[PDB]
Enzyme design. Sequence first.
Site, PDB file in Angstrom:
ATOM      1  N   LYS A 182       0.851  -1.182   0.000  1.00 29.31           N
ATOM      2  CA  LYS A 182       0.000   0.000   0.000  1.00 29.31           C
ATOM      3  C   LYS A 182       0.881   1.223   0.000  1.00 29.31           C
ATOM      4  O   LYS A 182       1.551   1.506   0.997  1.00 29.31           O
ATOM      5  CB  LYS A 182      -0.860   0.073   1.240  1.00 29.31           C
ATOM      6  CG  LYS A 182      -1.910   1.176   1.124  1.00 29.31           C
ATOM      7  CD  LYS A 182      -2.403   1.637   2.470  1.00 29.31           C
ATOM      8  CE  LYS A 182      -1.396   2.573   3.140  1.00 29.31           C
ATOM      9  NZ  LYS A 182      -1.320   3.888   2.435  1.00 29.31           N
ATOM     10  N   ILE A 237       8.162   8.160  12.501  1.00 31.86           N
ATOM     11  CA  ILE A 237       8.322   7.478  13.770  1.00 31.86           C
ATOM     12  C   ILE A 237       7.013   7.175  14.491  1.00 31.86           C
ATOM     13  O   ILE A 237       6.847   6.081  15.043  1.00 31.86           O
ATOM     14  CB  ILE A 237       9.329   8.227  14.662  1.00 31.86           C
ATOM     15  CG1 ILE A 237       9.684   7.391  15.875  1.00 31.86           C
ATOM     16  CG2 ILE A 237       8.810   9.625  15.048  1.00 31.86           C
ATOM     17  CD1 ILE A 237      10.678   8.066  16.789  1.00 31.86           C
ATOM     18  N   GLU A 257      11.823   1.472   9.018  1.00 32.99           N
ATOM     19  CA  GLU A 257      12.852   2.455   8.661  1.00 32.99           C
ATOM     20  C   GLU A 257      12.127   3.751   8.829  1.00 32.99           C
ATOM     21  O   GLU A 257      11.179   4.052   8.100  1.00 32.99           O
ATOM     22  CB  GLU A 257      13.437   2.215   7.277  1.00 32.99           C
ATOM     23  CG  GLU A 257      14.715   3.055   7.046  1.00 32.99           C
ATOM     24  CD  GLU A 257      14.484   4.476   6.544  1.00 32.99           C
ATOM     25  OE1 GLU A 257      14.307   4.634   5.311  1.00 32.99           O
ATOM     26  OE2 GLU A 257      14.603   5.422   7.332  1.00 32.99           O
ATOM     27  N   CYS A 291      14.856  10.657   4.131  1.00 36.13           N
ATOM     28  CA  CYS A 291      15.162   9.985   5.397  1.00 36.13           C
ATOM     29  C   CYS A 291      16.631  10.204   5.755  1.00 36.13           C
ATOM     30  O   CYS A 291      16.972  10.418   6.911  1.00 36.13           O
ATOM     31  CB  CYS A 291      14.761   8.507   5.256  1.00 36.13           C
ATOM     32  SG  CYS A 291      16.009   7.424   4.588  1.00 36.13           S
ATOM     33  N   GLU A 392      13.099  15.736  13.673  1.00 34.91           N
ATOM     34  CA  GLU A 392      13.160  15.605  12.231  1.00 34.91           C
ATOM     35  C   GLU A 392      12.107  16.488  11.606  1.00 34.91           C
ATOM     36  O   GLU A 392      10.936  16.168  11.650  1.00 34.91           O
ATOM     37  CB  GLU A 392      12.898  14.145  11.792  1.00 34.91           C
ATOM     38  CG  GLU A 392      13.092  13.921  10.282  1.00 34.91           C
ATOM     39  CD  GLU A 392      12.774  12.498   9.831  1.00 34.91           C
ATOM     40  OE1 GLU A 392      11.724  11.947  10.208  1.00 34.91           O
ATOM     41  OE2 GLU A 392      13.568  11.937   9.050  1.00 34.91           O
TER      42      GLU A 392
END
Lengths: 498, 496, 496, 498
Positions: A182, A237, A257, A291, A392
Amino acid sequence: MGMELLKHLSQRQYIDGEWVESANKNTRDIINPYNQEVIFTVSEGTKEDAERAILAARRAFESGEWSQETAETRGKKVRAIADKIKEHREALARLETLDTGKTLEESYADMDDIHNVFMYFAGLADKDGGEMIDSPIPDTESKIVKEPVGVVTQITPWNYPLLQASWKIAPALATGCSLVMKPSEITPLTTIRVFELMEEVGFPKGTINLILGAGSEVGDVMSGHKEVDLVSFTGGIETGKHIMKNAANNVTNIALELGGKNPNIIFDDADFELAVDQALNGGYFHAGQVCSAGSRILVQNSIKDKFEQALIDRVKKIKLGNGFDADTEMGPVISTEHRNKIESYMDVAKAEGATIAVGGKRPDRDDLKDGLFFEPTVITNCDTSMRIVQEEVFGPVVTVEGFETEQEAIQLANDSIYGLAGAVFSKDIGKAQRVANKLKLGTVWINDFHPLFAQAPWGGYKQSGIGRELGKEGLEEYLVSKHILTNTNPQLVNWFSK
Amino acid sequence: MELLKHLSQRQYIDGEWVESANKNTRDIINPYNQEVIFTVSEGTKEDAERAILAARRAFESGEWSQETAETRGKKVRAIADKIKEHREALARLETLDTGKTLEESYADMDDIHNVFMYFAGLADKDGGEMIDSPIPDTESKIVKEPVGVVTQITPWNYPLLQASWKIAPALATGCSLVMKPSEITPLTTIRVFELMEEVGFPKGTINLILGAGSEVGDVMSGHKEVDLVSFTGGIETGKHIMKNAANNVTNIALELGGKNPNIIFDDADFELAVDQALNGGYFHAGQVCSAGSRILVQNSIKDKFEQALIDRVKKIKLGNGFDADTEMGPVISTEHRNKIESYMDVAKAEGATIAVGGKRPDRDDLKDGLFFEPTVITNCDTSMRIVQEEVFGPVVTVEGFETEQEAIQLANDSIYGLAGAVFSKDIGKAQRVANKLKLGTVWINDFHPLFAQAPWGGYKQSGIGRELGKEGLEEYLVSKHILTNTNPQLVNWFSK
Amino acid sequence: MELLKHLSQRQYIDGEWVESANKNTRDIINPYNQEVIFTVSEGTKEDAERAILAARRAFESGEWSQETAETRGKKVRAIADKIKEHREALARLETLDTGKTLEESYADMDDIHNVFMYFAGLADKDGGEMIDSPIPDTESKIVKEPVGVVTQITPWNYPLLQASWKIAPALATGCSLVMKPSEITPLTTIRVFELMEEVGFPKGTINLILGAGSEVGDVMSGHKEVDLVSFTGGIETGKHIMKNAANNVTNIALELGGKNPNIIFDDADFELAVDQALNGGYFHAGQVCSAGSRILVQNSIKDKFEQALIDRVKKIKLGNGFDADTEMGPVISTEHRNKIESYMDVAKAEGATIAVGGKRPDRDDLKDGLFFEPTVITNCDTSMRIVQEEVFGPVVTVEGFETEQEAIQLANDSIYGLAGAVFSKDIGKAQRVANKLKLGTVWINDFHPLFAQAPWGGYKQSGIGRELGKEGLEEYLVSKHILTNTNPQLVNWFSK
Amino acid sequence: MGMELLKHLSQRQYIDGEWVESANKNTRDIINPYNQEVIFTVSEGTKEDAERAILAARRAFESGEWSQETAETRGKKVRAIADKIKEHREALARLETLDTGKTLEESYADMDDIHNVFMYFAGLADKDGGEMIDSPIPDTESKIVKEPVGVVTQITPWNYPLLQASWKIAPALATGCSLVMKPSEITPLTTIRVFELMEEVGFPKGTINLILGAGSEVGDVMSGHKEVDLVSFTGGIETGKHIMKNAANNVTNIALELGGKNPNIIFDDADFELAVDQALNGGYFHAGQVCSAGSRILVQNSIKDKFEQALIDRVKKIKLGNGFDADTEMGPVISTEHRNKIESYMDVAKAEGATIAVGGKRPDRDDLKDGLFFEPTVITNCDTSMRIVQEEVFGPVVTVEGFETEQEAIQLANDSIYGLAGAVFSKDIGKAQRVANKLKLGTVWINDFHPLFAQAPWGGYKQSGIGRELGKEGLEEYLVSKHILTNTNPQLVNWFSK
Ligand SMILES: NC(=O)c1ccc[n+]([C@@H]2O[C@H](COP(=O)([O-])OP(=O)(O)OC[C@H]3O[C@@H](n4cnc5c(N)ncnc54)[C@H](O)[C@@H]3O)[C@@H](O)[C@H]2O)c1
Ligand code: NA
Ligand code: NA
Ligand code: NA
């Protein structure tokens, strides 16, 4: 890192060998961040659709049509997919640029990497069925057989859709698994296209399935269904933690990840122009929506002032625009909500006492007002205790902190909840190697920034993830070990009275 | 499958034997007679946190994590030798605390020496790989480093054995660890720590916490400084731990028992199958993750098999683990015995038959202990709870199957996937069955074998990851890709 | 188990198709009718030397040896595709030159595509290892590099097949190579070079020498610039080569055929064993390194087996390889047919019986070719030359054995150790036998299977080293240990 | 880098579980090179003795007592040997010094390495029985079983007898092989002792055998007997070639390590004092009688004069003497014949036009006159075309050549028939690494000289050998692969008419 087709592109989900609409006929308009115009409309699947795909994946796995196929033949099929990627390189790249906004150049490089990912795994397919163990028990044969892990659910993000997809699809098919994938609801175009290509290659009914839809609606089914053996996810996250908790309901393997707070360490004996050039590359490719972006710059005190000025002067010259225009160096961010999140970080930064040295707003220029643009930004006068440094942002933004010694750079670089990637710039290779050995990161670059390839494992320490993608280790997420021990001279133990 | 007067009663944190921060204690019991045999500290969550922080500090100091792999191997080997050296006392200790026979306990000590020895030898055998880079003028390498700070939680059935499976690889790779054995059986774990202290490890490398999982458990699974949580126990605690570990995206290794099938075909060596069916269901009163609680027997010989098994089960000798005639000791605690008793009720209520056993024995020397009769449950099917759920007691169920294909479907029809066996003189058939069972370990004409040379773990709900073997050691390592550009050039993507 | 008008007639040296330095040529023959089908250059020893020097130069230039492993893989894969693309013509060409059936030839081309593809995919999978150093402040790594310049010599039975086994790994690892096929069958090798040229390799990376082994052979095995000599052929030429290679302490990889046992127990599937006994002895007129020339049959069924095999051997259809009804073609040359005929004399002189065959067929369409009847030799024993020596023709011997132990002793009683089979429905027994046979490959209930995924080679006099599999690739790599002292200090051993 | 043990040390061969004298009662006097006095007398075996040992090795291998023992149990035995080595460290080292002449400190270090070689292999014993292959043919099981290679003959040299012996014995015993070893006829003391220790550990009769004698008498039997599966030899190139040609008679596997012409490359940016120190270590440990000695010094032109003078001044201070005296830095050469060979090279050197800068003769000092001493020597003004540069002298002698550039150092270093080891001295690690990647050597040291350990393979490219010792690759010389392919659904091919 480094239109004709829409009229023929499918708008549906691919379940159990058939292109189908959502069970409730719902749709979703897909947007081009350059101008925020609707470019396409696709099915918006339901949780029952996801469940049907999972059940079909299970059935196909138990039938053995793909799981019991020879490893060599599976390799040939994965290679055929690799070739269709290269064959449709131009259209796939345009499609990825149209949907994500990044430059065509960046997109061509992604397609090149995608062909290589599939080719790498195609080749690894028949290279390792397990081991023969020297048994400590006489009259026994001991062996470890590596089997496909089973049914796998795969969820990908919006920054590099097809690229992240290949990292999961390639090993899953090479090992003999069945999968349900997906993509991000806001960028599904290339994923739809890759499924069409896979269908041309030919896989037994149910081996591959594509669900389209919001993570909030079908996401939980994909991570908590009892028939799933592995949940592989790449994204943020928060969604990652949720997924893991949901996966725990069935003690399901998880591969994650989740991005990071990647340090770019620049020493005073670094090649200066190189460091400036790579600092720009680390922070601004794909508008920093990577990332592996080098959002956290650590520069030695002796050259901090020289560096800050040099970087700032360059950032002002970055060319923003349409990804299809050759002069474009940086495209727009992915959506309204993501641009707003970035804007909020600017507020947090100033409120904490940091300085917005340059950028920190939307550009006014006419051709950019209709898009989701945000100026490349440099934030100075900050420290490790600030949120802007610990979190981030995932935008065209970088922070600069100074360090005095080798030991300080290491402590500062390791002072985050993350551990994905990072770089060390220094002409003293011996020093660069000592630093690299002490950084708690999955990948460390010495005098470079962004390199990653199928031949080597990618993943993070700490909160940047669990497991690895790419390389032999990436393939291993898709395998499970079984120890078969045969007693060639069976004797009664006679422990219990007779 | 005496020393108490000199044994420590404390926790071992940051190189020191210490009491709980609140001075609380816990009485340890012997399941043979339910008498208090020892008293130990009952640690606090602040004690667990202090141990984790000490582990982190010791890991960052590099005293153990940067020691040569070879020297770490020598230390693990020295532990292996202390185990063998104190084989007698450790086994008696394990029997006194868990109730299993002394013979079973000696065998555990022999395996424990071998686990440590195995890992001692693997220590310096693999620092990573050199990769042929697709980018010209670059050197690519994968360095394998100790995963970091590790928390380790073990169960009460085989305390020292389960502990060795975690401690050995952790120390061999260079990690720092915090271990917590089952609150009801910490004796051998306390003793092994005393032995490790004699070997000598840098302060903080090894730490022992004692206490209830309900009090210190969450800190060991959800602290931000932990890189890996390794747990062996029940499924519910396992799921909880995994959810907690997700708060910091922490790696988890879990081994949670199963519903292990013992498949017996009509062409099996009959007496061998009866003998191994007993071994599979009744060693350690069936309190084994690998117990063969679920018997699947081909219809043509079901009646012959059931009668033969039942007749044997009636002869099983129960008693004190220290008495040589003992074949089966008591269960671990009151609560666990009660759980088993409740399963007997569930079984009958579902329509199954308690062919033999199903109660507590009333023979004078057994009345004071936590004994429960070996049991055989017949006339059942896969839809029943008694067949789908892990009872973890001296109990087995028997179901019949007609064909090879049915045995496979029935065996795989559970939420588990830890281990199982196939009994048949037709090896070709046994191999076809083994290839189709979704189990981490499959035995052909045997039951229970497991050793340090091969990975042990489960498919599906029996776990995540593996213990033992090279794969077990890998849980304790983390990969780092170091890529060096040997001819760096400016990309010149951004205007100047 | 046509193109000639456009096929090159020259050698390929240092990127150019060239004639022999002395313009000498050689007529190539079709064994079906002994007619000249083509004429090629007959190279000189100076040509071979020039090719070796060009290989060395190309290797030192780094154009291929320093190319990325991934890109090298892509090139090897492109060769794999050209093979499949020209499958029809290559197979006809191989049949025309070697005489085997076209069906056998199609199967070879299919295997050849797979050999290249396999190696294409293995190319970028292993650059070496990172070692955990026992010396503090040091980094230790093992880099796997291409072994260097390699000479490759192939036989006449399966020219392209044997050539692929050497060329694929050599190119995948980054080596430079000089190949020389059998002087009597160079057609498909010339064609594969034309195809490799289309793919494109740096000048000197690949070189093709054509000629008699007696003239250029010594240069290829004893030149100082060669790092590896890889040869497949007869034992005498192999030993000569190895001795010549020793002059420069050059690595050798040898595969020399064998005296392959086909062990048939009384509980084997009888019709299957008869069928495989035929396949083992008569494919390619038994001119296969892996031919099952030595049949070992249990005494209890020896008479039944001998009659069943003999009756079948009389029905074998001999003829032209291009005719679909052909089951067995002719032998390779006059000299080889004569060598076989001489073995028949040795057999009878020793006291053995030629049960059937043992001569040339008279039928009109076969008189012009190099045909020799499928043969079965009975009433023989291990002490005879006919049993100890590799005849390499459509001939098999039959010996009986009483027990499992005797079959093993007899099977292992030869100077060879290449391959063999065990036919028995009792798999457990087949496995015990297989574990004791000193053979590189053992088949259980099969005969001939071999594939790129697994190593092929022999124990004892059947060879040194392996071809195919990871181990086959390793013959083309050399290890280098690079140790960096990260904190260099003076030892101060010597006075100051 | 033993007065009273001699009274208890065996003087015989060890064949088929028994200590025996030579079949013809012949003996040999063993000498101490420090004073050339006879220290011991041992049996001088016959070729029939060697043959009997080989046949006993074969018989023991076929019996399976050791070859079929569990890999774990074999590991424990190898480990027991490792502990006996450490236990008798003092006596073994004295014994090695008495027999070979090298310093006692060098000998203690050898014993420490020997304990580690055995321990290493003890640990590797049960770690790899082969692998499971994913077969391309349906209904087949494919596996590769790694078995002991069989009967192995092992021949060692006189420079580091026990050390070279451990490198062969350890993997041979760990894999399950039977072996026949023969140490150098002039230095068999520690080898005899290790056999006595192995006997205490306990091995099935015939598994281990020790032959004593001249290579010229028993050597051919050990390399050309038909029952031998592997011949492993460490020594000189001429004997090595002979052995290989003899081994070819039975197409027997050979493992050879033949020394080299090891370059020590010193760049102008090397740590100067470190390079001088290591140049001394490279050329003069064990009087340069080391396969890995750095006899060929390549120094950058810009610092050649500085380097030569600094090295020469140090060479004059080297302390020669008895290996048992703590002040000794260099002992004597091994024998009269070897000292003579060295002396002849001095003549060849001068005749070719080279200069003997220092040394090049026997020392006259009273306490050294009775021994086989030879002065540490430095030969200058030479080039790659000279024999003194191309040939292995294997004495306390080094040559010095200059190079202009990085590329020249590489060409010169690679310009020999050898390829065993070498070093690169430079503070520029990046440059050191480029050089190392291009040297055709089995081991390259960056800023060090001599390091070698059980964990890593040791061996040479080109004429320095065939195969490797130490590491996993060293163990692999002692294994042989067998592919067992089982067809689980056998069908008749029906190719031949019925
Ligand atoms: N896989 C096995 O070998 C195994 C072992 C024991 C029990 N079991 C199963 O579990 C049941 C009984 O086991 P149990 O409940 O006594 O043991 P459990 O499953 O809770 O495992 C015991 C260990 O977990 C710890 N623990 C408890 N709560 C914790 C928490 N919140 N966080 C971290 N650690 C915590 C305990 O202190 C102890 O160390 C049985 O029904 C049986 O089926 C399986
Ligand atoms: Na021909
Ligand atoms: Na051989
Ligand atoms: Na001596």
